[PDB]
Structures are given as C-alpha cells and as structure tokens.
Amino acid sequence: FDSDRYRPTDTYAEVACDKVCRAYEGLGSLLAFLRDLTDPWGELPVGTPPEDACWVSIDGMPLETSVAWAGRKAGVRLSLESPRGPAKRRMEDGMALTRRLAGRPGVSVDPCLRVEDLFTDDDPQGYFTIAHAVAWPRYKIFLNPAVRGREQAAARTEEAMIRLGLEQPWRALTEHLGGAYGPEHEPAALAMDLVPGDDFRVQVYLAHSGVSAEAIDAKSAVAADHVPGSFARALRGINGADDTPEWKRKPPVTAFSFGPGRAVPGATLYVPMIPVHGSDAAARDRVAAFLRSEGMDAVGYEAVLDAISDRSLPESHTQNFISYRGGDSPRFSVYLAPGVY
C-alpha cells in the first residue's frame, strides 16, 4: 500500500467511486451503485492488499479505470475482479456477479452462460478466470481461455465461437492467421458484451510474442475495419524497438471483435504502456505525439491522466495499455491501474 490520495481504511468501492468521478472530471449514489456491484468485497479496506494480485490491474488492485474515445464521444468504464482467494473462490465470486447482472435493465447473460463451462473449472489455472467491466449501464465479462493451460486456449475459444453462432468469422480469422494459434497470436482473453441482439459482441484478445510491428499489422488485414500500416505505425512510433526486454515481457495485443451477421471480425490494437515505458509521463509524451499526428484528441487524453493520477507522472506507473483503431472512425482508449499498491 502506497498512496497519497487514499487512507488504508478507504474501501475498494470508495476508491472505485473516486477514480470514476475523477475520470469524468478529466472529461469535463454512484458509490451506492459500486458498493452493490462489488458486493461483498467492495467493503474491504484497500490498505490490506489481496494475497494474489488481481489480473484486472497492473498494480494488482481488483479495479481498473478506463476512458474510451469513439465517434466524437468519450465514456468512462470500470473493470472489476474479486480480490478474494484462492483462485476457485475468486472465480465463484465472478460467477455470482454474472448472475446478479442477469435481469438488470438491458442485460443479457444467456450467451455468457452458454459458454461459461468452457472457461471455468474446479481447478483453474492461469492468472484469472472471470472479470467484468461496466460502462455508462452496460456490462461485459472477461474470460480466460487458458483456464486449463495455454495449450487448450485455441480449442476452448473455438468451441465458444461455435456455440455462439460465430464460426464463420472465426474461421476467416483462423485461416488468415495460417490455420493455427501459437505464441505469435495467442488467445490470452475473451470478452463479451452482455447485451442481446445485433449489438452483441465478443472480443478475442491475441497476444503477439516474437513478431515485428509489420507482421502484427498484417495479421489484421482480415479485419472489417483494417487500415493498412496503421497498427505498424502506432507500434513503431509509440513503442519503438521490438527487441527490448520490456517489449518481450509485455507483447502487443490485437482484439478481434465478432458480431452476429458479420462475416469477418473488426480489429483494435492494444499497445502496452508500463513497463515498456519508464513512467506514465514518458508514455504520455509519446502517446500524445502519436495522437496529434493522427489528428486525434491528445488534450483530452492528457486531461484524463492528470485528473485521475495520484502521483506526478514521472513517478507514476499506472498505464496498462492504450488501444487504438485508425481510419475513418477512429478509436482510442487508456486503461489505468489505480496506483494504490
């Protein structure tokens, strides 16, 4: 525990509330909602870190704040994962939360419940099983295809894709990638928007170990929204040399998005921040320079960083990823550890 902003007795839910409010401030009762949402661990004091770091945040907190720009608008999102242990109890906490979201105003958890058995187990492996996010409310769930080892990740992902009706765009991706999944494009996570109908989306996050910016770009050429070279230019550009130990320890990620009635996936690039960059200030300078050269809003990005961060940025290590899509309908997001641990 290491905070100038929070006392050790502040609760997880109170930190969550504070971060969400400050993110809105940077963009220019909630507490009640979040206590309920994080029931019952949301009441735990933040001063006592979990036994096992949460996957959801690079500082191991059970909370991660996100701000997303798209279609000339910005929105705040919050990711959550139980800090409880051991892994099986953490998993069951998440299962419980999914079921508590069912029947919330616009929610559909049916697609999640039809593949849930694939990403849960009585003896789970890997650094997580279940996590969620809320956006302002729509919800999503994150699942670990490596719950029973990495070697089964592609198979488990594929079977879920099939159950969900998305075999065709999943086939398109799989063939584009050469027909097999390896460390070059490894299924590291799945997400689902818990909504019914055409707006339903599943994202498959592929990690890219030991490949160049150009090769990563080319893996996206099957995407509905592929802008040739744009991923290569973001990666080379923001993150420079691909041979640093820090690059190799946290490789880039592409989120492929799948929707009903869509023959091919969309693609969004996830650019690792800390620890590829030495601090949030260094990462900020380079991300801002890239945003400007793309004509995107670097001021709003920096305003959010400033509003939400608890330490001066050269001493702050809270940016996990930024995400980026170029072209006519550009997207940018930043994902932030609370920076409490």
Author numbering: 36 to 63, 71 to 178, 184 to 388
Question: Could you share sentences copied from the article?
Answer:
Heterologous expression in Streptomyces lividans TK21 and an in vivo analysis revealed that TleC catalyses the ‘reverse' prenylation of the cyclic dipeptide (−)-indolactam V (1) at the C-7 position of the indole ring with geranyl pyrophosphate (GPP) (C10) to produce lyngbyatoxin A (2), with the C19R configuration, as in the case of LtxC15. MpnD also catalyses the ‘reverse' prenylation of 1 at the C-7 position, with DMAPP (C5) to yield pendolmycin (3). The overall structures of TleC and MpnD adopt the ABBA-fold, which consists of ten antiparallel β-strands assembled into a circular β-barrel, surrounded by a ring of solvent-exposed α-helices, as observed in the structures of indole PTs and aromatic PTs222324252627. In contrast to typical indole PTs that exhibit broad substrate specificities towards the prenyl acceptors but with strict specificities towards the prenyl donors, it is remarkable that the indolactam-specific TleC and MpnD exhibited unusually relaxed substrate specificities towards the prenyl donors and accepted different chain lengths (from C5 to C25) of prenyl pyrophosphate in vitro.
The gene cluster from S. blastmyceticus encodes an indolactam PT, TleC, which is a 42-kDa protein consisting of 391 amino acids that shares 40% and 38% identities with LtxC from the cyanobacterium Moorea producens and MpnD from the deep sea bacterium M. thermotolerans, respectively. S. blastmyceticus TleC and M. thermotolerans MpnD were heterologously expressed in Escherichia coli as His-tagged fusion proteins and purified to homogeneity by Ni-chelate affinity chromatography. TleC exhibited 23-fold higher kcat/KM value for the C10 prenylation activity over the C5 prenylation activity.
